Amino acid sequence: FNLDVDSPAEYSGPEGSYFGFAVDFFVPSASSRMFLLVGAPKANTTQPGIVEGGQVLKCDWSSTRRCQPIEFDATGNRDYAKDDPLEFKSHQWFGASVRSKQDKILACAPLYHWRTEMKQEREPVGTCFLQDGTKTVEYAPCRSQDIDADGQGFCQGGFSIDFTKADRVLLGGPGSFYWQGQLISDQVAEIVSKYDPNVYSIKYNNQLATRTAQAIFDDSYLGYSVAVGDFNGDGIDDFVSGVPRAARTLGMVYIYDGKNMSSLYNFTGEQMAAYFGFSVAATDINGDDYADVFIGAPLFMDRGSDGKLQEVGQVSVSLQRASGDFQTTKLNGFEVFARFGSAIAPLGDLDQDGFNDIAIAAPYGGEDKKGIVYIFNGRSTGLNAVPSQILEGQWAARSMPPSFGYSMKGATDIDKNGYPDLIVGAFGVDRAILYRARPVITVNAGLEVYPSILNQDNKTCSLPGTALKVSCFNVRFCLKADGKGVLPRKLNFQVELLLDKLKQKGAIRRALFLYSRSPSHSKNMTISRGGLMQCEELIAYLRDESEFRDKLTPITIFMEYRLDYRTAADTTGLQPILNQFTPANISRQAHIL
Amino acid sequence: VHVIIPTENEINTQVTPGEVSIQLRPGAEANFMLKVHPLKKYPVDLYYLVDVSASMHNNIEKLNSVGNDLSRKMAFFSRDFRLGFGSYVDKTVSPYISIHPERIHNQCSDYNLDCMPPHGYIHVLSLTENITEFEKAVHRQKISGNIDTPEGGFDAMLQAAVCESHIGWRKEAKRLLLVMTDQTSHLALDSKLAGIVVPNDGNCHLKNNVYVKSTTMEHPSLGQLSEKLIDNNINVIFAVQGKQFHWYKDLLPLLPGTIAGEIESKAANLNNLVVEAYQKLISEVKVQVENQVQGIYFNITAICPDGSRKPGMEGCRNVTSNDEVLFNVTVTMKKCDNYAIIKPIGFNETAKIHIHRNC
């Protein structure tokens, strides 16, 4: 509920490059500053003879908003023999898939082709570039002697990647082995150490991978999309992988053991061609210390009361329990052909409530199909099915839909306020936009009536100006507030107290404040956050029985509060927001007996 | 609140009333009976959309016998039978096809086959009354090839269904799109592998009878495909030779107005498949409503010849000519805030209901 959608940071790349196709955050361990990583798979690079090679750009944030390319590869196509190229980098889609772990940046080119040494062919094997420190190496786990359709020739390695907290690279290669698909996982140290530019096929010693299977599993695309998390309690991140065309195009998600690749779990879709497993993610969404699994199914059709099928998109959410069992519920999208669930991105604890929150996109939804991102808050019972905030795309289609929300990444705090931010790509317009999370204020608002019971003859005080005796009661209210991240010390609040308002407008109010002869009062209050409740007491009296609708009714005592929002801002102009899961309207009742 | 059924001369022979006008208030409802009466001896437009990848050459050679034999059998089911023809292979991009310069034109490596260049969808013959012309177009059809098992079936179907001005579909006909294959088809999101990340816009993109957005747009989803097939009143018949038949069969519940059968291993039943599929389709009547009017809800119950009731678009089965099916249509308004269309799936006639409101 706390994202700032009024003052986002907007970035752009070269027209037609699909800038924003893939996004991540770059956070060096000790550089003091952070950058955004935005891919542009069709970008025209300066490489000698490569067309639309693709690139990854490092984008700044503080001060100005500018992006510059990372030189992972600054050469052309290496020869195998005179006038006989080994590799084909044109249209390789470099930057299509980008991930970074602290200083380590892994960027892949899923459409990279090469000839192999055996025969002069052109196979879409796929390669990745891993950069750390000041050294860059080429990682090409499928560029092996196991070639062609029955081998890794059509692997497209690097199609989808992630990082393991153990410093391992998880790579999906959906085309391996007659498109059965393959997962390959290796160590960062091995990838960096065992590198030689004169060697095309490199073996690693601590490599894990899936193997071939029966033809019944052909065309499953295992490793279409990957994610990591601990699903067996071993302290080792395991491997979550989407296999969208598995089980007779129902789609499946597999979880493999992160240590030895033994299979641990198998999730299945319900509907054919829903493409269950398109995207996967894992995060603790309920505070149970067990990773939960989020599986998209963007083409899912939700049948209505008349039997009509509406293509909306679905996300399956399953919670991990200690027994190894999963508890699964279903979240449906909101709009037809919006493809809800095509992108899932854990945000970490966006609102600092103790539970992780998650963003789910629907890139073709909203007016003009600009694209929408839905923010869903977590809780102890699992994900809240009702979205708290909706982010809409801000650009018109030029030739294709902006596809806002196509790719997202959260759980990184760029503005350094304790509340993680969210980067959302919109590649159809060659843009990327960063939404920052506002600080959240929790407010303790009290209201008390002393006494709640009174009558018209209980004359206890006199009126101002002329000391006429009236019945009276005291109304007290007070307010304290705080937050968890970086908030202004002084919170400027507006409060209003209303008396006896439960009646027809224009009606006589019987309970009035003595000094104003009025049913209402407001005050300007300054609350130190984390300080004492600031209290006030106003004295109310009843009008006598000459001006009334009745004599014996309830008297409502009602308090409302809100923030000022003029002085309530940090150095970037980011304003705090009140917790949207609490009321700012409270009441007590008094009665005339 | 009322319902008015026009007493003006009707312009529909199957679906009546073809025009309804009602007046609603929130909390109110009104209803009427919609009658659907299937005809005998329809004009029929049968378009053959054929998978021409290498694995299909065994079935393609049998289409030479189909022309005249099918025409004769259909004489008892139709009044005017026209045949058309087109073909598809796959999207002409990596990794689906070879992109090697010496094997771009000839995807196959079998030196006994002078195979055709790969293509997405090509229209070969416009629907015609001439059987000989159909057989000729088939006889000269060459076989192509590709690398990945699945084929670009759904993409070709959408274009065949949508590009009415090129195919020559008649309004005054039962429109039949027959799809021949042995393998399953690609899905909309499978195209990501080829670097295609742009959704199918559902439009017609033919130039010289060739689909030219085949390499830039992804495959249509089943949602998009059923929407276009129903909108263009096209009934679909799948003819599948392989074990993959069951894959297509189990998609039928997701694609209203679709039927599927098996091609025998000898491919000797191509005509029986079409005739049986036709007879089955003509015997099933179901309706759906396109409701774009905000605040309005519909509840339709079919009343079958045997007195049974079947809700919504479940419809009635074992329906013949000289046999009327009734649809009990109730329209209710829930909230204040145009027209809706109620139509049998696979029929050319529709009933348009206009909804007037006051609050």
């Epitope: 062609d148 359709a149 | 050459h57 050679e61 490596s109 079998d110 030196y111 006994n112 090839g145």
Partner: antibody, heavy 115, light 113 residues
Framework: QIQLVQSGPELKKPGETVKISCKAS????????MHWVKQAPGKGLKWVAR????????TFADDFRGRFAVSLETSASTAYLQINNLKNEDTATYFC?????????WGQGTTLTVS | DIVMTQSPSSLAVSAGEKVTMSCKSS????????????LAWYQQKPGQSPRLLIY???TRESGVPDRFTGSGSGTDFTLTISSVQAEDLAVYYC????????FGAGTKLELKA
């Protein structure tokens, strides 16, 4: 029905050149390549060459280069095999053929004798 | 290119017997991209042009009776005739189309006396 009609028997002396025709009917000539196969008088079949009738580009087997040439006259649906510098070893029946699986065909076989 | 070795060169049969003949390639004839074995069998009766019986190892050609069954994969292929007829006395050849087309020596069926 596809038919292939070859020229009649040829008798040549050593060193002479023979041109063997193959006329196609029943299909479009430029649709399928034309293959040539040599059958020595008592031995098995040896593939010699294929020509793509669409482009005119020949492909030869390793053992039949230099002395063999293949050409087209598309206007008359006819393919030709020319054998230069005939040797006694070239005595054989020469067949023209289409190997497309859907509709394969063979000519009657041209008998070539070298004295 | 690819040498096809066919064996035996001659095999005598009696009518009604099951007869097998085989052919061994020099390399694999299996196309990994199609999963098919590019080998075919031909029948040549004396005085006549040859006729295709089987293609892609086991796919039977139209007009060919089912007594002719092909099988095999990779490099090793077999042609078997169930209940051989007097009309089947012909020379059979194996052919590969993995690379340039090539034929084996051929197997002549003879009749037992």
């Amino acid at each position: 029905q596809i038919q292939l009609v070859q020229s009649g028997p040829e008798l040549k002396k050593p060193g002479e050149t023979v041109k063997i025709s193959c006329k196609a009917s029943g299909y479009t000539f430029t649709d399928y390549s034309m293959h040539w196969v040599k059958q020595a008088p008592g031995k098995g079949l040896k593939w010699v060459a294929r020509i793509n009738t669409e482009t005119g580009e020949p492909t030869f087997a390793d053992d039949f280069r230099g002395r063999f040439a293949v050409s087209l006259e598309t206007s008359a649906s006819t393919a030709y095999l020319q054998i230069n510098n005939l040797k006694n070893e070239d005595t054989a029946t020469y067949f023209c053929a289409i190997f497309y699986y859907g509709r394969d065909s063979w000519g009657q076989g041209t008998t070539l004798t070298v004295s | 290119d690819i040498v096809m070795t066919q064996s035996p060169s001659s095999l005598a049969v009696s009518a009604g017997e099951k007869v097998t003949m085989s052919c061994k390639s020099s390399q694999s004839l299996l196309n990994s991209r199609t999963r098919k074995n590019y080998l075919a069998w031909y029948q040549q009766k004396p005085g006549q042009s040859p006729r295709l019986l089987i293609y892609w190892a086991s796919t039977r050609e139209s007009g060919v009776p089912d007594r002719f069954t092909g099988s095999g994969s990779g490099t090793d292929f077999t042609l078997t005739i169930s209940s051989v007829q007097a009309e089947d006395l012909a020379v059979y050849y194996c052919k590969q189309s993995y690379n340039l087309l090539s034929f084996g020596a051929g197997t002549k069926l003879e009749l037992k006396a």
